[PDB]
Amino acid sequence: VDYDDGIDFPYDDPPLVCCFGAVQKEFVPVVRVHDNPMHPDIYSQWKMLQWDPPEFGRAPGGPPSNVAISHVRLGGRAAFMGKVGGDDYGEELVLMMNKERVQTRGVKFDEGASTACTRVKIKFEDGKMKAETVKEPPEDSLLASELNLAVLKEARIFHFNSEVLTSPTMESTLFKAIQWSKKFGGLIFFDLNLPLPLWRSRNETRKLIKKSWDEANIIEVSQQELEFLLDEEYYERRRNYTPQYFAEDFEQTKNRRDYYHYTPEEIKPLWHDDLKLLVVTDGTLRLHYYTPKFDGVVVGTEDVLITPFTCDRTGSGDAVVAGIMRKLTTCPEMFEDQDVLERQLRFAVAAGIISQWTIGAVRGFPTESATQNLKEQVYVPSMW
Amino acid sequence: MQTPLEELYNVKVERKVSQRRLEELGVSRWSVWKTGKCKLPWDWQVDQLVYIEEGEVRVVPEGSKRFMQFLAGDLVRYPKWLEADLFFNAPYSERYCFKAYADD
Amino acid sequence: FVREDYLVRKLSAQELQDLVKGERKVPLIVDFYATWCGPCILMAQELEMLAVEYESNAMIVKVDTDDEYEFARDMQVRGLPTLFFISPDPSKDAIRTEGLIPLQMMRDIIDNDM
Amino acid sequence: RKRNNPMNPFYHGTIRMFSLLILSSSNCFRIGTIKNSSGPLG
Amino acid sequence: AKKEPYLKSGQVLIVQRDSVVIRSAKPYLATPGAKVHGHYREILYEGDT
Numbered sequence: 001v002d003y004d005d006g007i008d009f010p011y012d013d014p015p016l017v018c019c020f021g022a023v024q025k026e027f028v029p030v031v032r033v034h035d036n037p038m039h040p041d042i043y044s045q046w047k048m049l050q051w052d053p054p055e056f057g058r059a060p061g062g063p064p065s066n067v068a069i070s071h072v073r074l075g076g077r078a079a080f081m082g083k084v085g086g087d088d089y090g091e092e093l094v095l096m097m098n099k100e101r102v103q104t105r106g107v108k109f110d111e112g113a114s115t116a117c118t119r120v121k122i123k124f125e126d127g128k129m130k131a132e133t134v135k136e137p138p139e140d141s142l143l144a145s146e147l148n149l150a151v152l153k154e155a156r157i158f159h160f161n162s163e164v165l166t167s168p169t170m171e172s173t174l175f176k177a178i179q180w181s182k183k184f185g186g187l188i189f190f191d192l193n194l195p196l197p198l199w200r201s202r203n204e205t206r207k208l209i210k211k212s213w214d215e216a217n218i219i220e221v222s223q224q225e226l227e228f229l230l231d232e233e234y235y236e237r238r239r240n241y242t243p244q245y246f247a248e249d250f251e252q253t254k255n256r257r258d259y260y261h262y263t264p265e266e267i268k269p270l271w272h273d274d275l276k277l278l279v280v281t282d283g284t285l286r287l288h289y290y291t292p293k294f295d296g297v298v299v300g301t302e303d304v305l306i307t308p309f310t311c312d313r314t315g316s317g318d319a320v321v322a323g324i325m326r327k328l329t330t331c332p333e334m335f336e337d338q339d340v341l342e343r344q345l346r347f348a349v350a351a352g353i354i355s356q357w358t359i360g361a362v363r364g365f366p367t368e369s370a371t372q373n374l375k376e377q378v379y380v381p382s383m384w
Numbered sequence: 385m386q387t388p389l390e391e392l393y394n395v396k397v398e399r400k401v402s403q404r405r406l407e408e409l410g411v412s413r414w415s416v417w418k419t420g421k422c423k424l425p426w427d428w429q430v431d432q433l434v435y436i437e438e439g440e441v442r443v444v445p446e447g448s449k450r451f452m453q454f455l456a457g458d459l460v461r462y463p464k465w466l467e468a469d470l471f472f473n474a475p476y477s478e479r480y481c482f483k484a485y486a487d488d
Numbered sequence: 489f490v491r492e493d494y495l496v497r498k499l500s501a502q503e504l505q506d507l508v509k510g511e512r513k514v515p516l517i518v519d520f521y522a523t524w525c526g527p528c529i530l531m532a533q534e535l536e537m538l539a540v541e542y543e544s545n546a547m548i549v550k551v552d553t554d555d556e557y558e559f560a561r562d563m564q565v566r567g568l569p570t571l572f573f574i575s576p577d578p579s580k581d582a583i584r585t586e587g588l589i590p591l592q593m594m595r596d597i598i599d600n601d602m
Numbered sequence: 603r604k605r606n607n608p609m610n611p612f613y614h615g616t617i618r619m620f621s622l623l624i625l626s627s628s629n630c631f632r633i634g635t636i637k638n639s640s641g642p643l644g
Numbered sequence: 645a646k647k648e649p650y651l652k653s654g655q656v657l658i659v660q661r662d663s664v665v666i667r668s669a670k671p672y673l674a675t676p677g678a679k680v681h682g683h684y685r686e687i688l689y690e691g692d693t
Contacts, residue, residue, distance in 0.1 A: 427604035
């Protein structure tokens with residue numbers, strides 16, 4: 001807006017990344033309707049949905065603090081920008097991030113608020129129960145004057161989710177943070193992770209995210225989010241088509257799973273000038289990538305049935321994003337070299353796979369050497 | 385399917401019969417059959433000519449999901465070997481005549 | 489003859505409607521969950537323990553978002569797990585919490601704010 | 603007989619027979635004067 | 645042809661101007677003295693000898 005902040009410094013390696021939003025424990029934001037529910041009380045059956053998940057939950061994302069923790073464990077450096085209350089739960093969240101060696105100088109305390117607590121009022125409009133927000137939680141109440149500009153000056157990637165778009169206060173604060181980061185040369189990473197309200201209608205969501213979509217240099221979306229934003233019914237019809245008499249080629253006879261790679265012309269409504277990399281994730285199975293110059297897909301895999309009693313997919317979406325951010329900062333040729341980009345994205349695939357082998361997102365985030373080991377075990381040496 | 389049941393099952397119908405045709409057939413000397421709301425299964429062993437005088441009947445051939453509807457004033461010829469269910473929902477009255485080979 | 493293994497009741501949106509409109513004397517805690525959500529397994533065990541602690545001094549219920557998706561969205565549920573703490577005093581406003589909060593934090597809300 | 607009986611209208615694959623098999627896209631696949639025109643002559 | 649992808653195993657079911665439809669088939673090599681279990685065109689289910 002006006003000037004700089006802090007003292008210019010040689011800025012130790014690896015380059016810092018900043019994660020913006022709400023620090024929460026667990027809290028899966030992406031919620032849709034699944035048609036295969038287990039017993040409502042016997043939660044010992046619910047693990048069967050971890051190894052036959054709904055498609056929107058194949059590699060779930062989470063709060064931005066998950067990405068920061070996962071990024072640090074993968075060998076990077078990260079700082080979290082956000083607000084917590086001055087109560088005991090607020091200290092626990094900060095102590096969790098300090099233990100994981102995430103910088104918390106960008107975390108502001110609000111001594112008059114209770115962490116993760118929203119005051120709402122219950123109404124009975126048209127014979128139905130609804131709630132409306134009376135006072136937002138401290139997590140969604142960071143002000144622009146409370147931004148740590150030293151972090152925004154140092155950080156090379158600014159990362160945020162669409163959960164901040166559900167808060168009037170955070171949305172205004174978000175666009176001041178983006179302005180500062182761009183002024184200092186930072187790249188903007190938009191990890192969509194649509195919360196429950198934003199799944200209601202395509203047109204309302206497209207209007208709501210359009211401004212933040214246009215400010216982003218890197219975007220990660222799931223296959224379900226991308227199809228919802230373009231046309232959900234066209235792609236479902238496309239998946240359900242079966243030739244009447246004979247297959248068009250030998251591969252169509254095998255009745256394999258659909259890994260459709262969207263053409264850059266289908267993606268065109270969502271492309272803009274400043275966008276450097278679009279990644280569409282089909283869990284860890286496929287990573288479709290799109291650049292101004294080229295596009296392609298990285299083939300991955302998953303194995304949660306290798307450990308049926310400890311598998312938990314929560315947080316695996318954050319590990320994939322953290323793995324992308326770890327390689328983008330240290331391998332800047334990823335943006336311009338296709339072969340280099342594919343090799344580096346296989347590192348992100350491996351991180352997602354390991355993350356699904358432990359109960360709890362933070363508890364199961366993998367280290368760099370474990371991720372590198374799994375990548376070399378899974379892929380043939382020519383693909384490393 | 386697209387083909388109507390009357391065409392498929394060879395059920396000749398002469399809706400809005402003129403009085404001339406009735407007298408040519410001698411309908412006034414035909415026997416009388418009547419019913420209320422009920423359900424009659426039947427397999428025709430010979431052709432039957434039916435002149436409906438009151439009410440209506442919905443005819444469901446064996447295994448069918450559709451029906452044929454005949455109203456008062458219609459002259460219906462049910463073919464030999466037809467298996468069907470006749471449904472009535474109100475008072476119904478008819479004059480009938482069974483036809484052997486040749487005959488009429 | 490055989491004690492039931494689970495204390496927390498699952499309610500429909502219509503059933504939860506009458507429970508909130510009707511007269512209540514104890515704090516009402518409403519849990520939104522889904523059987524496919526991994527963290528809900530951990531939350532289910534904490535709420536069963538909270539039901540044992542608060543035998544008749546609180547009422548713990550749960551709502552499945554797979555069955556009551558529209559109701560959850562109108563209640564401002566942004567994700568799972570989500571808890572609503574509803575006071576027996578009709579003037580006081582309800583408290584909505586997000587994430588796997590500790591059991592002690594639930595007790596403090598019930599005792600001091602409910 | 604029907605009269606002896608003891609719902610109310612008022613209220614892929616290609617068969618191969620010779621034994622039946624079904625042929626479909628799961629087992630068949632593709633490998634990729636005036637001017638005279640074809641038509642009836644009368 | 646040199647400029648064409650290799651064919652898959654099966655019988656030519658349909659011939660058209662610029663394409664062919666193949667019915668998938670799998671060959672089994674058998675040596676002299678081996679015994680075939682079934683007449684010609686006999687239906688064999690999965691796992692049958």
